[PDB]
Design an enzyme around this catalytic site. Sequence first.
Site, short mmCIF file in Angstrom:
data_model
loop_
_atom_site.label_atom_id
_atom_site.label_comp_id
_atom_site.label_asym_id
_atom_site.label_seq_id
_atom_site.Cartn_x
_atom_site.Cartn_y
_atom_site.Cartn_z
N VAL A 62 0.83 -1.20 0.00
CA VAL A 62 0.00 0.00 0.00
C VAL A 62 0.87 1.25 0.00
O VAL A 62 0.68 2.17 -0.81
CB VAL A 62 -0.97 -0.01 1.19
CG1 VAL A 62 -1.74 1.30 1.27
CG2 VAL A 62 -1.93 -1.18 1.09
N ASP A 63 1.84 1.31 0.91
CA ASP A 63 2.66 2.50 1.09
C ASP A 63 3.73 2.68 0.02
O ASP A 63 4.58 3.57 0.18
CB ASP A 63 3.31 2.48 2.47
CG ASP A 63 2.30 2.59 3.60
OD1 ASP A 63 1.24 3.20 3.38
OD2 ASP A 63 2.57 2.06 4.70
N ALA A 64 3.73 1.88 -1.05
CA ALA A 64 4.83 1.91 -2.01
C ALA A 64 4.99 3.29 -2.64
O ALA A 64 6.02 3.96 -2.45
CB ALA A 64 4.60 0.85 -3.09
#
Lengths: 57, 77
Positions: B58-60
Amino acid sequence: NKFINTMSQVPTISQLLPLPASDDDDLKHKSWDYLYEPDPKALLDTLLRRYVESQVY
Amino acid sequence: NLNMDLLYMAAAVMMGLAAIGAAIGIGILGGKFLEGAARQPDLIPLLRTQFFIVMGLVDAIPMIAVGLGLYVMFAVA
């Protein structure tokens, strides 16, 4: 009449409607509750009808 | 001059968009895990580990945006 055993039988009368069964309590059930399809109410109606039919059979 | 005045605005908008996206995505991911844990607690650690797995992806992009906003604000000025 009830088949107590081979030697004895008794005439009896028992209630069907409304549901006379005494209440019971549990934790596992309704905590890990059943997924209901389509909805819990119609299943309850069919279940009760089948139950009274089984009782009379 | 105008250069820093516009660069602070660019960093602000980029990091704001990144924060919005990351927060909403993580909230949805967490809400589904919460419903799955409410249904049956015996699978809580398994869902919680898959939650970490997915949240890692998600945080990529949001963290790329955050890093480039930080760069714009602190080295380009």
